[model samples]
Target: AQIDKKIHFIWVGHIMPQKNIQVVSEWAEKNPGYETIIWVDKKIAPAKELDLFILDMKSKGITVKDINEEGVCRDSIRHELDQESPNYGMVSDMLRLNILAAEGGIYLDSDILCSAPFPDEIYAPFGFLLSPWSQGANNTLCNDIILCSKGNQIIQQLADAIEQSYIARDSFEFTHEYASMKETKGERIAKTLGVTGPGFLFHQLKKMGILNDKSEMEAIHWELQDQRYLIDGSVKEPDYFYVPQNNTNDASWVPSIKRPGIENMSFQERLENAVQLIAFDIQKTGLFNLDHYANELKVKQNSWCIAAETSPELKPDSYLLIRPRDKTGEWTLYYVDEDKKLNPVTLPVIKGAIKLSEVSDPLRKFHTLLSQVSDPVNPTAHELKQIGRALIELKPRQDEWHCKNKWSGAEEIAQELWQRITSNETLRAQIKQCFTQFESLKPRVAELGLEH
Candidate 1:
């Protein structure tokens, strides 16, 4: 038997506004594994820094698609097909239509950072398959990344249903919008279609033989990785979530970042230590800290996994995540129990280091030192440069500690604090001194009229 198909990935984002365009471009450059495509809205200023950014993408070898191209059409005319469609349904239909020519592949959103390349076999059979969107409001059924296979019959059925559901959901969207209430469009459509959840629909179609079976539909599975959700659904926390994929460790059941002297410790001891770290750093609810957007979403959902939003500031040694704790400071990289619904895994808090920068920081060192448990590649220097650019902009302008007039001055030192332990004499000396000073200057830096 011979297989004929390609795995294409598309990232949907716009040119201007708050889109994380810069990060996306940098990532696309690094991950050349997939044939990546970028879809952006037109009308951005050529003078903007991001315009050069888009151009930079072209230079770095990325294909950019302008969504504003004339005669371009959305996936489906779901609204006209049915006047009661939901917005996402319409968007789904639009995407479906856009990719009709595209046989099978993965769809990546601009907000998401690709931590690792996915398996190609799982997506090549069926034209459309979605992954679980648990944190999103899309009722866990809406797959942000749709895997499309060539000659998928169910693809058309789903597309047709999307048009019908689109009209129906649109009516509810207005109702929800006017009522100022939270509603998931998929839930309503599933209700009308007599299904409990999207999984049940998937389950049913497969069961009834209406949908493609394992033989016809390609089997796409997930090699679970370590990641933290901002808030279940709403895109509020841009800081931790936007961390580069390569920098994040997979939240695995095996403990990777081993604390010193604990290498000899028993498994029971490691599990206990993990619980304590989660409760201490990741789970602690911090005050707004003079910044309005400093709220964490631990209370609403359990903190089993964690990721970086913005570059780690206070503890630039590693990025932080919420987890369970033991009395000792030693943390478990992964936690598991028979009763636990989800695996309790924690990635080392990426403190002070820039994304994928050179690998010598405590967090990176932590992972390297803990190689007895696991081994991860350090973020490349190029990746660090991309992250450093953002950190410079995010630093408080009023603070003498963070703000810098020159790239080589104290400002760069502050940024490098989030870096790895390297052979650079000046940087190494600065780190030694800065750690000593950080203990006393942290609170003072906040009080120095700099926004935390």
Candidate 2:
């Protein structure tokens, strides 16, 4: 029996604006002949609000089903949801795996709008999203969107792996460390990757030898579609594990309806174009099922730091100081020279530490920014103010201003300071500098009686 017998297109998520469900509904119109199902939460709307989607379902013969969390998490992975910890995101991920294993179909995240119809192929296909990895390293893979047949060995292994992850909680210790150390909780990316995401899927696939010789797999074209570019105009690859509020502004991917004449537009412009095509923009009211209180009350069982230097060996004449930054025991590395002078060290250093005097001036300055802060997690308002001021002071330094290698942290600190402070002398001066360039826009702001 070939595993490619089943056929259905699926999208999973809360019906929210960020998910942009309308894009999918419109894209579905192009594939009227195919079966489409939108699996969503039980209590998503007032039915009246989903009139368009409901109509689309009727006209296109699509199906909408409420995901059964209880059934999905029953016996095999019950504890994942039974515990007090916030694991709704994890629960949703688990449901996806269970659904694929039982029914066998294509799965897609809501944020992904269908660009085209699936090609008639050799039955079962496996697709992976390109992950952002360090240069010279293999690109990370993910199950953001994938297809399979019911009871396929790959899907079975993945479902069994997820169940095993819950059974042997020890498997997720690395993920739990990040959750415990982070100031906030709920679907931490590291944890998701270790548990549900490609981090888990990729590992299991490799263990099964399917990834090495993918004679059983067919690549999905959507995974090959280029979406955004890096600052230098090189393609900015997607790493689903990097969860942030906003994705990069650069994109070239357009929807099925607007492909003509819009092929050359930038991502930002194309996004506006897509927005124009939709009937109404969704303003999301956040819906979270996990308990924030219980997540915060629990103790941090693991002590692994997210990005920190732990176990340091000192040089013959120099000693290193381990300064604890937070309750998690995440440390900032420092080296004391023979003369008792303090120097900062870069990451992943040799078994023995090197003196700060041994590093370049830019690295030293970068380390200074890191040293000024007590802990990125537990910075007091006053401490944030100080760090922000330090960044602003360093922003104009010819040596440090353009040091892209180590400036992201410094720039973040500066941005945090800018948002916190009521008054900024530097910002005021910059505003004055910009007034010369914004002279034409002044009347527009003044016409509405808004402050410049």
Candidate 3:
């Protein structure tokens, strides 16, 4: 099943400026005889300059198709996203797959500039070609530049996979810290990658049995993994057919933040925006500060599962917060302390998170040590009992944080005090000694096996 001689690009939402107008013309001229289709939301018109440019495209016989055509398969895919904010390039992900699934063609990201004329042999079925980060050294896949025949099983599977994953309501799983996030309440980066971006496509390709070891690609002549076209500038030879836009940099998610007027962005978009801002460290965009962005979204949404807090002076460790879904259930908060363990024995005020902070502090060592008693991986009943006692001792701190509501840092500060009291050898030895003396007098407690 050879792919059709067609090129597809999606430009949706009123937000899309035809910044790549030149590329459109360039592609039409370079790849003559191929049908160039640009699906646009015809509900809105492009800028006057674009209107004039598009007419020139029409003269070249390109199809500026309306995206809202009823027969279009978007409904079969992510129609759940119809009215929602498509911030994480979800619409782009959604529309591209639907269109490509319906009309088998070569799909390219608008930013993927044409370095040289596309080779004719590319239309030959190559197990649905994907752009890998490395030509031979990497087997990763990006949906950004997909090549396959119409109704390619890979396209259907990838489409079905994304729909299934989204219906299950997690797009960013098994990815980054700011990854493995959910659409609704996840405070993560690389938000779209896991759900339907490169991470999603990569996992799907791996499941479909793409070569893992690069050398093996040569073994399978029934192949994939010819990345001569798209270059990230990682290679010295610049003979690529299509190099990335930002001086050959990989910026698949840049247009959202990098665009001129930030308008009607989704929570996920804002989240990624902040990460990109922090990542770039020098912001020229109109978006608020990262912390402010987080707070604003939480307030607007009025419910949250997680959030990140960091000082203005960019510390390496940012504090994290996780709010539990079930109010009555107790969840453990594992902190990456100087020695990684869940100390303080009590969960935080957020009830479902671990938060860490930093200053221009000395080398790390807390006076209190909170390591488990080298507890065997599977703890026996007595060990569980000791942990029960630990919880009973420390659970009171949670009440103060939630009940009073006055003190700003009470929840976090209580952790330090609780850890000190429970782990300080001198304090614990004195308390246990007195408790033992008292327990000996209480004969009923001994009968009940309450004495340690």
Candidate 4:
């Protein structure tokens, strides 16, 4: 008998350029001992990419409906971005939709990195696991990482109620509902027929008996504030649970996790661990579903393009073109503006500006640029392509500069590039003197506005 996996805790995310699926892949590798079912919204990712994802997941223990890899094809991309779309609301609905999918599963944003293992008891019985967490003084819900399971028939009904509520909202609402469901009485009935919409609405799960202080473990939410790195309370790894806005739509619900003692670690160390774990863990459980959102982004039934192909180049080393279909004539120049002061371009512009790769030192530079330019949900795919171009082209220049000028790690160049974006004179100067020769790029980095 084929018994469906109940209590299937899952996370929701689309596989598209903005979500940074590759980064999520890193988190999935190291994060073991957890069961996660990826609920992909219909037509969210490329059929081809989905096939690849299925193959990758089958190896990882992620059971899925059979999809043909050969039948996979590219999706049509958006002209610009639509403020209202499923892709836009994907993150906002993550919390509610997750509860609907199953008893519960951690709704990890694709951008988040799991530097530390998830708490050991996450999978154990917990009604609503709350991290050492509170939004401020009153809000105790840490929606980013949550654990829940409807073990019995009654709970399943409530879970289904929650899913229906999200589906109804997914149709009309444009943003995450933190308190609306409770605030409006009519809206409550418009969505759920039971329990008046948990907590903010009813203060407890009516479907289940509310045992106060019975040690029944309500839920766990990872308090992001606890892991402050610098003296000013800035996150060591700022990406963790960090939400960025995109357009008036604001789909930055994707959270980036910053594990303890992780921000300062050398890129090599993080990269090594990321690679080793992804290669190893994914073998059993497949890559986490959140990581594939980059390829499925769509607006008004049209998907977005991360990279555009004009024709197959005969050359194996053909340069990946970083051209924006939406942005007319928009192109990224690979070779550094020589004769200009910018830490002496790293490598000669080869072809494209790929953000990933061992040779692309100082991952922060690439990410910073993406953060600046991209709209939270549907970021400018063209910019990422351009960054790829810059990296490929600058490698030679960077290598030449490093060897001839004796410039040390590529991070030096990154710092300079970062300063260019920060626009804070004091912070830039501080980063400059404290860092290295690339500091010169600080003054002009902001002018370029490529930092996004």
- Each prediction's Cα lDDT score? 0.33, 0.39, 0.44, 0.32
Give one digit per residue, the lDDT tens place, for model 1 in 1-452. 11113333332221222344554554565455655565543332112333554665577676665544622333233212111112232342345434533343455444455445444344232334444342232223333344555445555455445444433332333232222223443444434322212332454455544334331212211212111111111222222123343543221212211111222233234333322322222122211111100111011111122222222322221122322232323433322122322232333444445665434433354443333222112222232323222222232222322321221333233333223222334333332111213333355434422321
Question: What would the per-residue lDDT of candidate 3 be over residues 209-323, giving only the tens digit for each residue?
Answer: 6533442312322124334323321223333345533355334443432221122234445445444332222122211122323333332210111112322332111111222
- Listed in order, each prediction's TM-score against the native is 0.33, 0.39, 0.46, 0.34
Best candidate according to lDDT: 3
Ranking by TM-score: 3, 2, 4, 1
Output the lDDT of residue 347, model 3. 33
TM-score of 2: 0.39
Per residue, candidate 4 scores C-alpha lDDT tens digits across 236-338 of: 2222233323321122432332211222234345334333322322232322111112112110110112344333321121122244445333432222122
State each candidate's clash count. Answer: 52, 1, 5, 61
Find the number of clashing residue pairs for candidate 1.
52
Off by over 4 Å in 1: 1-19, 26-30, 41-54, 67-72, 75-93, 100-103, 120-128, 132-140, 168-170, 173-452
Candidate 4 runs further than 4 Å off: 1-23, 35-37, 42-44, 52-84, 87-105, 111-115, 119-128, 132-139, 150-158, 163-452
Candidate 2 segments exceeding 4 Å error = 1-14, 41-60, 69-86, 125-140, 175-187, 212-452
Question: RMSD to native for every prediction?
Answer: 23.2, 25.5, 23.3, 21.2
Per-residue lDDT of candidate 2, residues 1-452 (tens digit): 22332233333221234234464565456555545666644432323224445554666566766555424434433333333232444555566777677766656554454445544332333421123222222233445555566666666777777766644433356533455533353336556656665566656755765455332122312223331211111223323212223641111111111111122223344333222211111111111111121122222111111122434433322223254556555335343333444455443323333666434344355455545556655543334333333332232223212212111232232223223221444332222111111234334324423333
